[PDB]
Design a protein around this ligand. Structure first.
Ligand SMILES: O=c1[nH]c(-c2ccc(Br)cc2)nc2ccccc12
Ligand SMILES: [Zn+2]
Length: 208
């Protein structure tokens, strides 16, 4: 059911997606251990992910959340990095894409910082890095992130340094409470609350 449509770099939609990728890079407390050392990316391709059935599954659930929250879905566009990006774009998000050991419990994790989602592209903690060179900071191999439409509804605010939502909430927000430069991370507990709208193929760039 999934088709991928390439965006032209001249397309304003390519440009606005690239800009959210680039402008949400930050330094990480592991010194680049999980995701590598870089201040920016080389964007190779941006594709729109089109699947009617998965879209309708998303919008069905979005309406449900919206009616439970004074007609406010509290929809965001957020990054997701995963070893399973290929399964996700073809079959949707579900429990097999959950971060069982995540700090806000077993759910599907998203980030405002593209560089945070980058840390998960090759697995939790970056795994063993790229399959070809075993390098978590590989500047050669092609990486992929998803830029996703995510329904948060009523989000439980956790201040801080698969399962269910907390009662009366549709998601969890992990608010950064130590690293003043960190953006928020979010967790949903239902695959139907995200749609993987853009597939972004890129390299991290070695700083000069
Ligand atoms: O973008 C993410 N991805 C994952 C992730 C974790 C485990 C697996 Br298996 C697959 C993906 N965790 C995150 C945790 C916090 C913020 C962003 C992310
Ligand atoms: Zn490599």
């Amino acid at each position: 059911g999934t088709i991928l449509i390439d965006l032209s770099p001249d397309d304003k939609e390519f440009q606005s997606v690239e800009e959210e990728m680039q402008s949400t890079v930050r330094e990480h407390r592991d010194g680049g251990h999980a995701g590598g050392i870089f201040n920016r990316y080389n964007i190779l391709k941006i594709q729109k992910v089109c699947n009617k059935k998965l879209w309708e599954r998303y919008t069905h659930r979005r309406k449900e959340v919206s009616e439970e929250n004074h007609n406010h879905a509290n929809e965001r566009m957020l990054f997701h990095g995963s070893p399973f990006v290929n399964a996700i774009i073809h079959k949707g998000f579900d429990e097999r894409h959950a971060y069982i050991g995540g700090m806000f419990g077993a759910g599907i994790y998203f980030a405002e910082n593209s560089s945070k989602s980058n840390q998960y592209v090759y697995g939790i903690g970056g795994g063993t890095g790229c399959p070809v060179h075993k390098d978590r900071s590989c500047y050669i191999c092609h990486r992929q992130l998803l830029f996703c439409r995510v329904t948060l509804g009523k989000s439980f605010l956790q201040f801080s340094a698969m399962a269910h939502s907390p009662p009366g909430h549709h998601s969890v927000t992990g608010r950064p409470s130590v690293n003043g430069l960190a953006l928020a991370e979010y967790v949903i507990y239902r695959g139907e609350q995200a749609y993987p709208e853009y597939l972004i193929t890129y390299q991290i760039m070695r700083p000069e």
